[PDB]
Amino acid sequence: IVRPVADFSPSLWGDQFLSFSIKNQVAEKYAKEIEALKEQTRNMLLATGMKLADTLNLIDTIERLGISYHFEKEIDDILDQIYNQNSNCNDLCTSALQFRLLRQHGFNISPEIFSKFQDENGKFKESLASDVLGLLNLYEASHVRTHADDILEDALAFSTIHLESAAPHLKSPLREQVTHALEQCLHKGVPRVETRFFISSIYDKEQSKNNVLLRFAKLDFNLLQMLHKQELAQVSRWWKDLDFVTTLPYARDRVVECYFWALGVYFEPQYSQARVMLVKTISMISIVDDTFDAYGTVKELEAYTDAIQRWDINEIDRLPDYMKISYKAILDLYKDYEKELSSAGRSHIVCHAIERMKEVVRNYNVESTWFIEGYTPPVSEYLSNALATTTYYYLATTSYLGMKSATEQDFEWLSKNPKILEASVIICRVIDDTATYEVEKSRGQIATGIECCMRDYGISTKEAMAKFQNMAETAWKDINEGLLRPTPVSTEFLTPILNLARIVEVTYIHNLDGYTHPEKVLKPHIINLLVDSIKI
């Protein structure tokens, strides 16, 4: 009968997103100049007789500027060529960037390219400590390691200590790029977030900047932002006419933050339908989470869990009134997905995301049973249940729904919990528990990941958190390895999973829960991405 106290902060945003009306004269004009600029940039890429270092810096800059999604065939062709020519006679700067760009695109370049920069013990020659650009590219490259790249185990520490030492005396914008890299490396960042910083804080301030590229990048970032703002408007209108803000007061109102998540997974225009389906799923499973977490009684949660398993509108009446609200909304949402896809013949694939939802909810229920009984499972058993409650198997499966190129054989792959997906789920799991340990512990949670780990192994909280960090590191090595060719599905279907690991890194930065507490971290991100245009 008696419910908990609701210490959730309300949406920072209000209705400032509910109605955006594109200025079409502007949009049509940005697009007009962009087509012209696109071809200029393409000819830059297909220009013959460029040196190696120049080619890599070109591709690098086009990627950091956020426009590389325009030139996927042209960039692949060039990198493919570089991979096969085996250019092993350069400095640290060009070598490190060559290794990173090729690895990021699935080209298994050998790490022995770095041997000429190391003495005996495979430790980097300290005589390189004064080459700042080399250190910066090594820093970035060190984050794409797989398990076969032990040659690079010293790279992060070596480059970090010397970049820190050099930083204060460097010129601008180099200093700001260095400082930002030490806080957020490129490989693990949300693309639009890094792109926004690079375009405005760095490239725009560089003495050597290419005016064509900076122009292209500013107009492209502002044009896509208009698309994102229309998307957020229709999603905000959707969330509004659902009115969980008042009929389900206990839940987190975070539909903007959910859109930021969906924007992290993919930002390109061809994924606009996929983006809208995803944000709706995310915001809705967030409602269900909060119901198990800090509202529903044990008997209520049992009925809810079984009703979901049966997926039948005939079953609503077993639920309390407040659960009827979210239960119908859920079933309605998937009815909507089926009709949204029927005009392309892809309705059936919606059953895959449904089955992953059922699995999420079963495991919410187990988490609650455990909490009621005061059971502290062994780490093995805790993970068997807690990996799915991340919702990451669910969100990954959902991200394929709006992708027109997704086939059945791609859902077959995902459904077998392939390595790359499991790594992304683990990273989410252990980063969450590290961040939410203290608070959730003081709410009486006896079965937190860190607590299971302590009790199981007989190790202090510090040793336990350290161990959870290694599972994250291991998982990032598995992610990077899962991107190497030949890939088991199209790269197009790996990127969302990689992008889901990125979101976790970005959202829980500095060891805090950014979704539940969006002001410190997520707020400036959503502003730079969805409120403020780049000063053109």
Name the active-site residue from 237, 362, 513, 516: 513
Alpha helix segments (H runs only) across 241-349: 244-247, 255-265, 272-294, 298-310, 321-341
Distance from C-alpha of 265 to C-alpha of 392, rounded to nearest angstrom? 12
Q: Which of 252, 254, 275, 502 is catalytic?
A: 252
Which method was it determined by? X-ray
Give the residue from 49, 50, 41, 53 showing the smallest Cα distance to 137.
53
Closest CA to 105 of 504, 497, 484, 509: 484
210 phi, psi to nearest 5 deg: -85, 120
Residues of the chain with CATH 1.10.600.10: 5-48+209-535
**What are the percentages of helix, strand and coil residues in the chain, rounded to 5?**
70, 0, 30
**Cα–Cα distance for residue pair 241/467, rounded to 1 Å:** 45
433 marked as binding residue = yes
Question: What dotted CATH number matches 49-208?
Answer: 1.50.10.130
Q: Which of 41, 94, 195, 391 is catalytic?
A: 391
The answer to whether residue 487 is catalytic is no
Peptide bond into 191 cis (omega under 30): no
* 289 labeled part of a ligand binding site: yes
Neighbours of 72 (CB within 10 A): 12
Q: Where in the chain is the domain with CATH 1.50.10.130?
A: 49-208
How deeply is 340 buried, as exposed, middle or buried, from its count of CB atoms within 10 A (0-12, 13-18, 19+)?
A: middle
Question: Of the residues 139, 304, 364, 515, which is catalytic?
Answer: 515
Task: Write out the two tokens for 94.
Answer: 């060009």
- Is residue 407 part of an annotated ligand binding site? no
Q: How far, in Å, CA of 318 to CA of 341, rounded?
A: 31
DSSP annotation of 12: S
Cα separation, 146 vs 144, in Å, equals: 7
Amino acid at 5: V
In order, the DSSP letters of 264-279 are HH--SGGGHHHHHHHH
What residues does 118 pair with on adjacent strands?
Answer: 124
C-alpha–C-alpha distance, residues 278 and 274, integer Å: 6
Q: Is residue 154 annotated as part of the catalytic site, yes or no?
A: no
Q: Which two tokens stand for residue 428?
A: 């989410």
Q: Please report where in the chains the tokens 């590219």 appear, as a residue.
A: 137
30 classed as catalytic: no
Catalytic annotation, pick one of 61, 281, 291, 390: 390
Is there a contact between 186 and 140 (Cβ–Cβ < 8 Å)? Answer: yes
Among the listed residues 146, 195, 389, 507, the single catalytic one is 389
Q: Rounded distance, CA 9 to CA 7, Å?
A: 6
CA–CA distance from 318 to each of 292, 312, 331, 495 (Å)? 17, 11, 16, 41
**CA 401, CA 334: separation in Å to the nearest integer?**
11
- Concerning whether 478 is annotated as a catalytic residue, the answer is no
**Radius of gyration (C-alpha) of the chain in whole angstroms:** 24
Residue 252, marked binder: yes
> Binding site annotation covers 440?
yes
At 420, list the tokens: 């790359």
| Whether 515 is catalytic | yes
DSSP 125: P
Which residue has tokens 């990941």? 449
From residue 117, how far is each of 15, 83, 154, 336 by CA, in Å? 55, 20, 12, 57
Q: Given 103, 275, 356, 429, which residue is catalytic?
A: 429
Structure tokens of 402? 């709006």
d(C-alpha 524, C-alpha 128), whole Å: 36
| 80 in a labelled binding site | no
Resolution (angstroms) stands at 2.3
Q: What residues form DSSP beta bridges with 219?
A: none
Please tell me the CATH code under which domain 5-48+209-535 is placed: 1.10.600.10
| Contact yes or no for 381/455 (Cβ under 8 A) | no
**Is there a contact between 398 and 341 (Cβ–Cβ < 8 Å)?**
no
Look-up: residue for tokens 């909280």?
461
Q: Distance between CA 431 and CA 511 in Å, rounded? A: 8
How far apart are alpha carbons 39 and 194 in whole angstroms?
24
Which pair of structure tokens corresponds to residue 283? 């915001």
Residue 221's contacts (CB-CB under 8 Å, 6 or more residues apart) are 66, 195, 196, 199, 534
Query: Would you call 237 a catalytic residue per the annotation?
Result: no
- Asked if 139 and 159 touch (Cβ cutoff 8 Å), the reply is yes
Among 30, 261, 334, 392, the active-site one is 261
DSSP track, 172-228: TTHHHHHHHHHHS-STTS-HHHHHHHIIIIIGGG-TT--HHHHHHHHHHHHHHHHHH
Mapping DSSP onto H, E and C, the string for 412-444 reads HHHHCCCHHHHHHHHHHHHHHHHHCHHHHHHCC
Answer for the pair 263, 275: CB distance below 8 angstroms, yes or no: yes
- The per-residue DSSP string of 368-417 comes to HHHHHHT----HHHHHHHHTGGG-HHHHHHHHTTT-TT--HHHHHHHHT-
- Based on the residue annotation, tell me whether 413 is a catalytic residue of this protein: no
Q: Is 304 designated active site?
A: no
- Residue 43 has a CB neighbour count (10 Å cut-off) of 10
Distance of alpha carbon 484 from alpha carbon 429, whole angstroms: 24
**Length, in residues, of the chain:** 536
C-beta contacts of 304-309 below 8 A and 24+ residues apart: 304/361, 305/361, 305/362, 305/364, 305/365, 308/357, 308/358, 308/361, 309/358, 309/361, 309/362
Whether 146 sits among the annotated catalytic residues: the reply is no
Is 429 a catalytic site residue?
A: yes
Tell whether the torsion through CA atoms of 57, 58, 61 and 62 is positive or negative: negative
